[PDB]
Each structure stands twice: as structure tokens, then as C-alpha cells.
Amino acid sequence: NTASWFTALTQHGKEDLKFPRGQGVPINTNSSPDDQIGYYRRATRRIRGGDGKMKDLSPRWYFYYLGTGPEAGLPYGANKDGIIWVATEGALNTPKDHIGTRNPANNAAIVLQLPQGTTLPKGFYAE
């Protein structure tokens, strides 16, 4: 009943999303150095195509702070298909339930922006 705080990263290539061991956490001025840790979750959608058959759209990757979201129970590093982990140096490996997720009724999504020098895999674009 709740959404990611940020807009999604859309996967346009065959590469899966992945970041080096200090990159990938979206910028949020209303968060602290301890909170800068979370995961991206892949969300695939299916639509009626041109032949009338079902077809997959491009996968979307949504960021959630650690301890929040559809995989709030997973500890950092947990093995699960469709889940990739990110953290910045100094972040605390504790659940961020104090941040939680977004209610689109009273909060717009934060435009996802990565800090200067973030290395993305092929098929991903940083605004």
C-alpha cells in the first residue's frame, strides 16, 4: 500500500543493475549519512502486444531503503532474484523503518538522481 520514495531506473539493455561497493544510493536531502543504504527491486510489467499476445515491458528498478519496502525483512546482502544492494561508506547496517516508504497521496516521488561519478552498467542512464 506504499511506494518507493524515488522514480525508477528503467533497464534498457540485457545487463542487470549493479553498482560498485560505495555507489548507487539516491540523493535525498531529508536523509542522514547513517541512512544511506538500501536495495533496488526489479519490477516487470506485462502488456498486450501487437500480435495480441502478452509481452514484457522494460524492467523497472525501484530503490528502497534497508528495512523498508517489499523486502523490508531482508538483511543487507540477502540473496534474492530481482534484488541488488547498495550502500555508501558510513551507513549503518540497521533497518530504516523511521524513513519507511511513500504514500503517493501526500508525497510526490523524488526524481532519482545519482551523485557525480556514479558508474552505471550499459543500458542505464543517470539524470
Q: Is 41 annotated as a binding residue?
A: no
C-alpha cell at 63: 530503490
Alpha helices of the chain — where are they, by DSSP H?
A: none
Identify the experimental approach: X-ray
Q: Give the integer Cα–Cα distance in Å for 61 and 40.
A: 6
Q: Give the integer Cα–Cα distance in Å for 13 and 94.
A: 33
In Å, what is the CA distance from 77 to each residue of 33, 41, 71, 85? 19, 13, 12, 6
Resolution of this entry, Å:
1.7
Q: Is 21 annotated as a binding residue?
A: no
The backbone torsions φ and ψ at residue 87, rounded to the nearest 5 degrees and listed phi first, read -160, 145
Amino acid at 36: Q
User: Among residues 44, 91, 90, 89, which one has the least CA distance to residue 67?
Assistant: 91
Kindly give the pairing relationship between strand 83-87 and strand 37-43. antiparallel
Under DSSP, is residue 14 helix (H, G, I), strand (E, B) or coil?
coil
Q: Is 45 annotated as a binding residue?
A: yes
